[PDB]
Symmetry: C3
Subunit: 165 residues, 3 copies
């Protein structure tokens, strides 16, 4: 069965995978997102599976509910942020890849995010390359990026349903 | 008629103009300030005019309500933060100029901000030079700077009115 | 009588001393912590004394209630954040020393903070060396570090009381 190296959070109903280089503040981003009222599925590694044409991501036991942040150590998220701050599984909707500005590819349309696609167990998951600047309120930026994505996906779902004619 | 290159926000009843070099997180600052409960007038460019001894700043249509943040793209602020998160016009009270610490002039009195004056269509608008350090919670700092300014202006208005003797 | 160079805040019932090199955002950290609902005892310097087997820290008058942040100047914290945002004294429970990542010593157990002890007027105060990265939401990190510490101290107090057998 299938593992995947990333953090997995529920943000605005969207299961969001977060990826990037080591020691850029990913785990710190998870914490900040939890503090804004979002939810943790898993830190570091995720179990993946297909059930009913859904890519579901789940955290293995033992590690469930815990986050590591250097300086702090282990964080029992449920103890500190409530039982509703953690979820045992959720569908994967989006994959965000945090990239250093210098390594960021050229932008075709700067009025939109840099969208790509990730193949996760043969399923197309939308993927955004997001430039990471230190101290521009990254949690708010990622939350805003995800909410925009959900509106955009609902935009396509409306358009498809609009073809009832 | 008169344009002006800056961001224009309403903060604690004060119309505040934000200026600075390119790619330092100005638009990201606007978003963060909106998230703290403040209001957007306009991103990038502002229409200015004089009405009843007031310098009023207004956003041109089409662009009204939208913010661009690299990585995210366009942000329909009303859709995401509510109708009350945007305002069509407001009086200009303060101009903050975000400066890199290295380029910051010498400080005469470090117990107060570095105050200057901007001539905007012949009107004296108070101007603060604010040093920008990455990740010291700039939104909170700018909010605090503006609230202090309003108290200070109310201090002079009290003093002037105190000369009833 | 005894002074001590540090910032002193009440965080989650814990009197916390904050220390570090000059111009790293300590005073900015105090402000941010106040904004999260915590309390100021004193900026810069603290009066210390022993009363009833407690190390109590108190702010000298005149300076009481005020914070200096370069760019802003003086901040009357009570005026801006309420009377309950400042406290005249509190017991010292923890000492956090903000360290630059490069100067940070080797980590024995990365699942826990780097704990040391400070002798303050002959009393053992637990001391954490915390690595400071710009823009990972340091206020949230320090708040989380302190809440974890309180749980940990309550853990030892439970264990000691558990030796009733």
């Amino acid at each position: 069965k299938q593992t995947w190296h990333a953090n997995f959070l529920v943000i605005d109903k969207m299961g969001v995978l977060i990826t990037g280089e080591a020691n850029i503040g990913k785990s710190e981003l998870s914490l900040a997102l939890i503090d804004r009222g979002h939810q943790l599925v898993c830190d570091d590694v995720i179990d993946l599976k297909q059930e009913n044409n859904q890519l579901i991501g789940s955290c293995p036991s033992v590690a469930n509910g815990y986050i590591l942040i250097t300086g702090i150590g282990i964080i029992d998220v449920p103890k500190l942020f409530g039982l509703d701050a953690v979820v045992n599984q959720h569908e994967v909707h989006l994959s965000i890849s945090l990239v250093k500005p210098e390594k960021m590819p050229l932008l075709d349309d700067p009025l939109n995010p840099l969208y790509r696609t990730e193949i996760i167990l043969g399923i197309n998951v939308p993927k955004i390359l997001f430039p990471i600047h230190p101290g521009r309120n990254l949690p708010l930026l990622i939350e805003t990026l995800v909410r925009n994505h959900r509106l955009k996906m609902e935009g396509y779902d409306s358009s498809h349903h609009f073809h009832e004619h």
